[PDB]
Amino acid sequence: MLIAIEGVDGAGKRTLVEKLSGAFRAAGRSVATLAFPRYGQSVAADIAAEALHGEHGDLASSVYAMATLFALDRAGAVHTIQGLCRGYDVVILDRYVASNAAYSAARLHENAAGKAAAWVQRIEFARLGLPKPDWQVLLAVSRDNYERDAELQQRTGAVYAELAAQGWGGRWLVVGADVDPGRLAATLAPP
Amino acid sequence: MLIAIEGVDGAGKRTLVEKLSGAFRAAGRSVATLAFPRYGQSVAADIAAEALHGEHGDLASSVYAMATLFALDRAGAVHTIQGLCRGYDVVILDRYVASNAAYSAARLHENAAGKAAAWVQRIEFARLGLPKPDWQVLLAVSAELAGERSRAELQQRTGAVYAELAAQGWGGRWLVVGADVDPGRLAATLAPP
Ligand SMILES: CCC1NC2CC[C@@H](Cl)CN2C1C(=O)NCc1ccc(N2CCC(n3cc(C)c(=O)[nH]c3=O)CC2)cc1
C-alpha cells in the first residue's frame, strides 16, 4: 500500500509520518518512508530547493519550470518507490505529486480544475509513470520563498482541499493535526 | 580526445562534425560523435524540445530553467561520453556546454563576462563534473540577417558572446574556423600526427 501525506509547509507532515509509521508497526506491518523533494539525493531536487532560496537566476519565477524540476526528481525515484512497495507492507511518502499540483495552481491563482493541476497529472502519472497512490492524506491546518509567502500558503491550502474533494490522482482522506494515528492506520489499512 | 563543435543556429555544425570525422578517420584515428541536446533520448531533452515548440506553460520564458534542462540532459550522458572516450581516439560533440553559456547570455542581453555564462561554468563543470573538452571549435559565420535590415537580434548576440568565449578561453582552449575550413588541416591542428 502506497500512502502520500500532503499539506502546506508547516502543517506537521513529518510528525504525522513518524506517528503513522509507528502505528502501522504496532499493528504488525512493515513500513518504509520516502520524502520529496529528495534534497541531497538528486540534482533536480537540489536545484529546485536552491532556486526557492534565490539561487539560479530567474528559475524560480517560472511556475512550470519549478514543477518540472520536482517532477524530474520524482521520475528518478520510480524504481525506488516500486522497490519499497514490493518489499514492505506500507510505504508512506512525505509529500508527493499532489504537492506539485497544489503549489503550481496556487502560484498561478488557479483552482484544482485549472490547467496546472491537469498538466501535473499528465506529466507525472501518465508520461513519467509515477506510481499512483492508494491513499492521499491531506493534513489540513489553519525558510524558502514559498514558506515566507503567507498568501501563497493560504491559496495552496485551498487548492489542496479542492484536489481532495475532486479525487485528484486517487482516493483522498482529510485529517487534522489532532488525528489519532492508530485510528488513521486502521482506516487506511483495516485489519 | 574530446572536441566540441560550437556556433549559432544554422552555422553548419553537423556538416562540420561529419567532415571532421572523415578527416580524422582518413588520418587513422577512430571517431565517435554525440549530439546535444540528446533529443529523443532523454526525458530532460524531450521536455526542453517541447518547450521550444511552445508547450509547458511558462517553462521556456525562464532562461535558467531551460539552461538547467540542457544541463540535466548532459548530466545523464556522462556515462556515454566516458564510454566513447575509452573506446575511440576522438569523440566529437555536436554542441556542448558552451552552447548553454552563449544562448543563455544572449537571451539575457549579457556578455561572456556576465552572470549567466559564469553560472553555466559553475553548475555544469564545477558542480556536475561534466567532462571538460580538450578543444572547443567555434564555427563562426556572418552575422548579417536579411530579415533584420529593419534595425542586435538573438542570433547576432549569441554569435558575439561566442566570439568572446573563444577569445577568453572559456572552459578550455578554443579554435575559431569558418565554413570553408579544410577538414584535413583542421584535424591535423586538433591532433597533430
Ligand atoms: C537551423 C534552424 C535555424 N536557423 C536559423 C538561422 C537564423 C535564425 Cl534568426 C534562426 N535560425 C534557426 C532557428 O532559430 N530555429 C529554431 C531553433 C533552433 C535551435 C534552437 N536551440 C538552439 C540550441 C540551444 N541550446 C543547445 C544546447 C546544447 C544547450 O546546452 N543550450 C541551448 O540553449 C537550444 C535551442 C532553438 C530554436
UniProtKB/Swiss-Prot annotation, chain A:
Amino-acid positions noted as binding ATP in the UniProt annotation, renumbered to this chain: 7-14
UniProt pathway annotation: Pyrimidine metabolism; dTTP biosynthesis
Cofactor note: Binds 1 Mg(2+) ion per subunit. This ion is required for catalysis, binding to the active site transiently (at the TMP-binding site), and probably acting as a clamp between the phosphoryl donor and acceptor.
GO cellular component term of the entry, any: cytosol
Record note on temperature dependence: Highly thermostable. Is half-inactivated at 65 degrees Celsius.
Protein's organism: Mycobacterium tuberculosis (strain ATCC 25618 / H37Rv)
Pfam families noted in UniProt: Thymidylate_kin (PF02223)
Secreted keyword on record: no
Positions annotated to bind Mg(2+): 9, 147
InterPro entries, A to Z: P-loop_NTPase, Thymidylate_kin-like_dom, Thymidylate_kin_CS, Thymidylate_kinase
HAMAP family: Thymidylate_kinase
Name this protein carries in UniProt: Thymidylate kinase
Catalytic activity: dTMP + ATP = dTDP + ADP
